[PDB]
Amino acid sequence: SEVQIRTPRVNCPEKVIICLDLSEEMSVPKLESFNGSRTNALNVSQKMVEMFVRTKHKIDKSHEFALVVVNDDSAWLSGLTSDPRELCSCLYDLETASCSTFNLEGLFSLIQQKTELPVTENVQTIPPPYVVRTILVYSRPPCQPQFSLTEPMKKMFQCPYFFFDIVYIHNGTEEKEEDMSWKDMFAFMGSLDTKGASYKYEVALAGPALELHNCMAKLLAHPLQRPCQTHASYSLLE
Amino acid sequence: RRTQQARATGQENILLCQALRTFFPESEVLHSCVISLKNRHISPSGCNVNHHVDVVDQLTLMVEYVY
Amino acid sequence: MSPEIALNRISPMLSPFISSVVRNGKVGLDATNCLRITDLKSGCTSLTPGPNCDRFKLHIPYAGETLKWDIIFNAQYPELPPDFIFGEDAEFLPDPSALHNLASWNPSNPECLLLVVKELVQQYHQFQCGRLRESSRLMFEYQTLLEEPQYGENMEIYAGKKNNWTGEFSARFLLKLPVDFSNIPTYLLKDVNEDPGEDVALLSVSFEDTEATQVYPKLYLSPRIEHALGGSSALHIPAFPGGGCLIDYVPQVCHLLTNKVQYVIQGYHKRREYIAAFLSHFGTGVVEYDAEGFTKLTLLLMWKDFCFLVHIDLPLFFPRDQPTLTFQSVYHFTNSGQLYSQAQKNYPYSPRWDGNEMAKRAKAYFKTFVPQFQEAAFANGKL
Amino acid sequence: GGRHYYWGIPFCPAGVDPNQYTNVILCQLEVYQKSLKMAQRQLVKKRGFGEPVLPRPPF
Amino acid sequence: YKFRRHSDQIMTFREQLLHRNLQTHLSSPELVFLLLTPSITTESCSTHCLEH
């Protein structure tokens, strides 16, 4: 029946790896804030990630968190910890100098090397011991091709207990220039989710910052209890 | 003889569907598990109406006390 | 040797029998539930390659003890029935007339071996009763206890040989209680591959004397029952007061345990109705909920383009006490670095309501209180 | 294109009264409870039977 | 006689019933049962033992 969701809906503990793009483009103070005016993409990201972690910890507590930055290659700050303080210690100390492009191969390799995926005798009824999910906040172009990944990476995505959520900050809807390339690169990220389901978000550099917070909130949902992205609506007060 | 014998050549959640269809069939087509990727409206379902099913069990405990 | 390691050595044509037996994880009432298969031998010419094993020894938990029975198959004749050896229990008299499933042995049915062993264990029970016949004192109880079929046919008994001097006998009763544990909730284990097993409560009675004096009772509970009642170590049972009348003791424990179980399960199903109604209504924006016990829920809502969270915490007395609502901001942090949040527990509520009425009243409370909470978050919280 | 939920859709869809779908999602949860027990009893490794209830120790 | 590869030296459930049924049908209450258990004495299969 077209697309099928086999996984049970149970509140398993989450291992959440949050990836931040550190580019010169992230130091742009063009995001409008609902209090005063202007704000930086990185400071909004710090407030957003701190709020996300503080909120997730108050729910069930058993959740585990990790922080990763992206430059020429992925880099691990603090991870697989149930105490959020560690993460905040590494979070409020970031530089955004961009001296190279961003490699997905390195990120997949580091994530695979730092944690293993689980398996169960029955994936349709037996709830897994934990669920692995990775959030990527990115803005720079991927340069389009970069080949079609490898067998181990496709197997990583093939796992029903592994989730990849993405937020892309782009000028495709602002400029409408090279809009073909912007939409094609978003679709390049949207052609990997087809391994089960996953959440994707798009934001303009005009903001306001609200649309980014309003975005991170939507990623709080537990991936096994979270409905399909296209079905999710929050304005339940008309 | 064994060679001649060898060459001779001698997926829905059925429990959920049957329990849903047996629980208050007054809802008619309400028994479903497929939706349009766009709008939140029901799509037709192929699980069929024909199976015996076993272990039909309590939906909610219908009791009320105080103290 | 773990079963998953043994099942790689057995002849493939025989795997299903042992698979069914292992997966049942018991035969009788077991109590200890620590079933195992130990000794495994080739039972064929040493040069037979690949999976080949067919002889084995099975540890069947019975009453309080464990019987070590050797079972024999022949790999190159899989259709044929097995053969049995009852370890050092020589006096065991298995009546071949009662073993219908052995007389009608059918390899086409994987559960056949289990049915055979089951009937054998029933005959072993009868054999232990045959041994009990010599005591008379305990038969006084046994007869009256057998007159209750829901107990008599869900019962097991065991007796130790005479002491060389004094001639005292040790004995055990085991009972499966006929209470509806079917509606007990689920819970996640460490291994997940682990199985909590059949939801049962077992009552074991042990004696020091061949008479009705000095009795040690124990009540064993399925892991799910331990989770439902908050751990075995926090629950007590009335000890036997004196005289001889288990026929008057067991009804008390059954009635009391049914009272406690219904106490918890009523609350559980009412919480499930609440969470089910709230999902039906606002699931399009659900964040998380306790799929194991329905004690917590967390929803993400939007008011005029501003996001906020609501955490619903349900107490043990959910049908009686009001569930605690907790509004939380996504933008504001307090001085302590915690997110700005406010709890409501005194609000419009009636314990008699159903899921739908409570969900609609909660939507009304949202529409009426969200602006107040937002103004308060701006007043107290910092961005 | 249609999207299929093995355990049913977890919300009241368009054109349905949620007051009557409450019981539908209750049925989803009951079916999951009863199904998980049957799927668990097929696993080889069995969980320990924990500790017994002792009578109230006096003195 | 009977050969049971890897087995305890004591006659089985089936064997006792069968021996007594043969004692009945052949009218010989002086029958004997020769039980042989061959087995291997090390993992290496360098030493074997036939106990009868």
CB-CB: which of D24, D30, D31 is closest to B30?
A: D24
| Chain A partners (3+ C-beta pairs within 8 A) | B, C, D
Q: By what technique were these coordinates determined? A: X-ray
CB-CB: which of A5, A127, A230 is closest to D6?
A: A5
- C230 touching chain D per CB within 8 A: no
CB pair distance less than 8 Å for C266 and B40: no
Does residue A20 contact residue A41 with C-beta atoms inside 8 Å?
no
Q: How many CB atoms lie within 10 A of CB A217?
A: 24
CA quadruple B51, B55, B59, B63: dihedral positive or negative?
positive
Spatial separation of the C-alpha atoms in residues C121 and C137, rounded to whole Å? 24
Cα angle at A182 between A180 and A185, to 5 degrees?
105
CB pair distance less than 8 Å for C292 and A58: no
Is chain D adjacent to chain E, meaning 3+ CB pairs within 8 angstroms? no
Look up residue C71 and give its two tokens: 């079972």
Residue of C85, C47, C44 lying closest to C68 (CA atoms)? C85
Does residue D9 contact residue B41 with C-beta atoms inside 8 Å?
no
**What total number of domains does chain A contain?**
1
Interface of C with D in 232-261 (CB under 8 A): 232-233, 235-239
Does residue C61 contact residue C69 with C-beta atoms inside 8 Å?
no
Question: What is the end-to-end Cα distance of chain C in Å, rounded?
Answer: 60
- What residues pair up with A68 in beta bridges, in sequence order? A19, A76
Deposited resolution, Å: 3.8
Question: What is the end-to-end Cα distance of chain E in Å, rounded?
Answer: 10
CB pair distance less than 8 Å for A213 and C338: no
- B-chain CB neighbours of A3 within 8 Å are 37
- β-strand pairing of E2-3 with E35-40: parallel
Spatial separation of the C-alpha atoms in residues D32 and D34, rounded to whole Å? 6
Q: Which of C198, C265, C269, C320 is the mutation pick for testing B, counting most B CBs within 10 A?
A: C269
Q: Which structural domain range is residue A137 located in? A: 1-238
Does residue C288 contact residue A231 with C-beta atoms inside 8 Å?
no
Cα D35 off chain centre by: 7
Spatial separation of the C-alpha atoms in residues A16 and A115, rounded to whole Å? 11
Q: H/E/C letters for each residue in chain C?
A: CCHHHHCCCECHHHHHHHHHHHHHCCCCCCCCCCCEEEEEECCCCCCCCCCCECEEEEEEEECCEEEEEEEECCCCCCCCCCEEECCCCCCCCCCCCCCHHHHCCCCCCCCHHHHHHHHHHHHHHHHHHHHHCCCCCCHHHHHHHHCCHHHHCCEEEEECCCCCCCCCCCEEEEEECCCCCCCCCCCCCCCCCCECCCCCEEEEEEECCCCCCCEEEEEEECHHHHHHHCCHHHCEECCCCCCCCHHHHHHHHHHHHHHHHHHHHHHHHHHHHHHHHHHHHHHHHEEEECCCCCCEEEEEEEECCEEEEEEEECCCCCCCCCCEEEEEEEEEECCCCCEEEEEECCCCCCCCCCHHHHHHHHHHHHHHHHHHHHHHHHHHCEC
Backbone conformation region of residue A152, classed left if phi is above 0, alpha if psi is from -120 to 50, else beta: alpha
The residue type found at D18 is P
